Amino acid sequence: EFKDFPLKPEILEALHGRGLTTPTPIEAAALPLALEGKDLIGQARTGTGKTLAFALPIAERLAPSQERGRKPRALVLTPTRELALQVASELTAVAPHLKVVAVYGGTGYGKQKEALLRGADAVVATPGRALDYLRQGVLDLSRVEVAVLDEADEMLSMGFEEEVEALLSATPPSRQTLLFSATLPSWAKRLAERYMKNPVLINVIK
Template identity: 40%
Template sequence: MPSFEDFKLNRQLLNAIADAGYTEPTPIQQKAINPILAGQDVMGIAQTGTGKTAAYVLPMLMKLKYAQGNDVRALVLAPTRELAMQIAENIALFARYTDLRTVVLYGGLGPKAQISALEKGVDIIVSTPGRFLDLYLAGHIVVKQLQMLVLDEADKMMDMGFIGSIHRILEIVPRKRQNLLFSATMSELVHKIAGDFLKFPTVVEVAPQATPAQTVRQVLYEVPNLKTKLNLLQHLLKNDEDFNRLIIFCKTKAVADNIYSFLQRKYGEEQVRVIHANKGQNTRINSINAFKEGDVRMLVATDVAARGLDISHVSHVINFDVPIVIEDYVHRIGRTGRAFNTGDAITFCNPAEVYYVRKIEKLIRQQIPVVELPAEVFIEQTPFDERQAIAREIDMQKRKENPEFKGAFHEKKHAPSSAKGKTANAAKSGRNPVNKSARQKRRK
């Protein structure tokens, strides 16, 4: 097994790596660091939680070495604020014995403090695409000295519709630069941007794309309805020794808020936090920090938090809902079993979600073991409205696979034309529309 000494990194970086407690490089680091140090364009594909960030941060710091001038020399683009902040934390961790200056940029906050930080001089910018473009177009960022451009979590960036922003950024940065692209999955859009972005890249793939880490144990519970999901969640959480730090992923903000309220009533406000797109930036940062530091046992989140949460020793990830964007499953469960630790990923699946589970299994090329509901979990009757919603969703899935399919919820025929409609309505009321004028005359 090679060590970090084998990469010929300088003593400042090696000391920072030792202080961080890392002793041996992960497979993606073993394969990516040397090509990046050699100046090659690299496309890295690896599961989340395998050390992708350090795989490009360490050679980046080695190449930049020390603070120089006022203008940015390396730019890292990330899809979410949480991931941008996480990358900036990684850079600070490894650059602690250097004088390199890093500024992190993201929306949701006023730009005044970020502009002030840029004016003091910067070597590395970590940013979401939108905020970077805003500050560049306002004249606060000069890119003439840019040497390295990194796209992290490129697949999520494509899912979130950033392809236009990335093309605009590619137009304004110098043509002569080193490009790095990292992703856990390789969708059609990622292939497209890779073709525009990378020149004869070295492809580094440590596992087939979209493969969950081997350190994550996966199980699936087939649950008939929402109330039974809540009963199952409550049953699992009784084991507070094993379920000591967990993330509960939900499909929507409304469901996340409801689960948060439920857990808050059961376990108290000090044990649970919720994060989603409607929460203010400071609230999200404080919630994540409280969870990281172990002050909070449970974090309820939408997929906004599935990327970039690098938290050690998350014992369990619970998918309260099956994600509709199936690639998000890989990123959700990657929040546990990180950096050679083991973890558990538990998915609750109602009849309408089986469709997405099958697609996830096809994506990850493995079956998720189904576990019977514990005998202690009370199985609730499915209310009429929820039963209808599940049936409607299943109909829609069947129609997606077969456009000719006509289920119980197929679209109604168009209303009759206005002339026919009037006649029909009049007939229903027992009146003859032809005799309308005669009736009016009699009234007179």
């Protein structure tokens, strides 16, 4: 159960307050290495649940800050707007001490910009809108300590390979990288080769 893991009381409170008590098989498998700062690839069948495998480690690794205009120390990339909002919602709830900002197309071009300018600790973004702000200097990725690629195989199918690589290339290689994907197409193995540091593959095979 989550209380078993070594997580700050605020985080356990947040989880407890929300009913989340038992990690899914992929979460239980991935949490230990992720919490310890190591790079990993988490692979499991879609529809089981794995968001806590990267959100808890972001919650735990990052001390809070109130510095206006601060750059984000965590970046989560998702292939769709609806997943960016679901993930930003989860992360916001388990990291109550962090300012989480969702970046995604179709709306809020001005509002999301303003949010990022005021300050952010973690960004959950679709690659389109994110790359826009990257090019404008609005999204600054130079302080990223944890980068997460959520559903790498979908980002490939949606044709975001170029945006994803540009975004990762803008983060410091001192970062921890986590990659989650039901399948591992050649593109994702390459991302692994090029952007990760001796990653452990963790695969719930059946």
